[PDB]
Design an enzyme around this catalytic site. Structure first.
Site, short mmCIF file in Angstrom:
data_model
loop_
_atom_site.label_atom_id
_atom_site.label_comp_id
_atom_site.label_asym_id
_atom_site.label_seq_id
_atom_site.Cartn_x
_atom_site.Cartn_y
_atom_site.Cartn_z
N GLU A 172 48.27 58.57 28.75
CA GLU A 172 48.94 59.31 27.70
C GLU A 172 49.23 58.30 26.60
O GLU A 172 49.65 57.18 26.89
CB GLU A 172 50.23 59.94 28.21
CG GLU A 172 50.97 60.79 27.17
CD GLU A 172 52.24 61.44 27.74
OE1 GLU A 172 52.41 61.50 28.98
OE2 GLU A 172 53.09 61.87 26.94
N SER A 189 57.08 63.57 24.28
CA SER A 189 56.27 62.89 25.30
C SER A 189 57.03 62.94 26.61
O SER A 189 58.24 62.80 26.61
CB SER A 189 56.00 61.43 24.95
OG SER A 189 55.25 61.31 23.74
N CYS A 190 56.30 63.10 27.70
CA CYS A 190 56.92 63.24 29.02
C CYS A 190 56.16 62.36 29.98
O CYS A 190 54.93 62.43 30.02
CB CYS A 190 56.83 64.69 29.49
SG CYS A 190 57.61 65.87 28.40
N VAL A 191 56.87 61.53 30.72
CA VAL A 191 56.20 60.64 31.69
C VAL A 191 56.97 60.59 33.01
O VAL A 191 58.19 60.76 33.03
CB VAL A 191 55.95 59.20 31.16
CG1 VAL A 191 55.00 59.20 29.98
CG2 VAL A 191 57.24 58.55 30.74
#
Lengths: 125, 125, 125
Positions: free
Chosen positions: A117, B103-105
């Protein structure tokens, strides 16, 4: 003014977010993953996957009145840091002349179980 | 001018940091975790935990002369990406109209062994 | 204007990125790791490693017409959150007076298998 950005040449954002958002000359791009604009996953090498992520970012930037050359900071998240060497070959091809600040970290997992990402902060042209 | 922000309606910052910091129209909010303003952990569902994180962010933003509607970018860190579906239901409830970049993690671990941490960048009203 | 920053008093950036990049009063510093300016890894305690990271950031900021006192936001990535207590002792020594916003997360892995990476966003003096 906060201006959301939408392009058909990157995977569509879900209902709760925008592909990018503009605020006082800055463009904040959502973390892009290796999916095509038709919302299908890219299968293949990390190199192929990285190239798709780059095209997604580039196209959102273009819609944002920006470009790769106007990026200030890149954050790269990799599901496996062993893939960093391969990723870096693609990265260096794109950032051949313009050299933004960068951070790279190895995460436990990513949305939709993808391998990488990448998010970007840029300025308007 | 850099202006630190403090509110009693979010968990207190430790000595070395501020709940938020303002710099030229932008508001940078520290990563918020599922703790109540009395500094106790929220036990329960991811949904309940996400709601607390949202209230923490909202209250810091209010003290910062900002609000959820002025957020430019959200970064979500989850200790387990399996919880993303549940988290997203709560997220979508809050960002029903305004749609910042996101954003995602999935991370290995979070402070105090919590399940989620969310940071936000916003503009002043 | 986007202005890359280079200092000989931090580990050199690789070909594809810059130690820091300036954009409209803001300074975006690349994630710094516990390496000396001669590009050798620091071995030893988390405290020693954190001190090196701090010196790397400080020196890049100085070249950027900034300083620790002009930092808006710090992001700390730790390979093991068990090291957070030790890291925090060093952090608090540096941010004794100025208190930027902060986020801290535990990651799976970091570049060159280091124990910590820290990035910073600052303003020009």
């Amino acid at each position: 003014t906060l201006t959301p950005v939408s392009t058909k040449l990157a995977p569509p954002a879900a209902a709760s977010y925008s592909q990018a958002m503009k605020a006082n000359n800055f463009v904040y791009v959502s973390g892009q993953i290796p999916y095509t604009p038709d919302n299908k996953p890219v299968q293949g090498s990390i190199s192929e996957k990285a190239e798709q992520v780059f095209q997604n970012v580039k196209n959102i930037l273009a819609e944002s009145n920006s470009s790769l050359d106007n990026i200030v900071k890149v954050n790269v998240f990799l599901a496996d840091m062993k893939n960093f060497a391969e990723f870096n070959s693609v990265y260096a091809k794109h950032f051949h002349t313009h050299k933004p600040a960068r951070s790279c970290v190895g995460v436990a997992s990513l949305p939709l179980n993808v391998d990488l990402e990448m998010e970007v902060i840029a300025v308007e042209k």
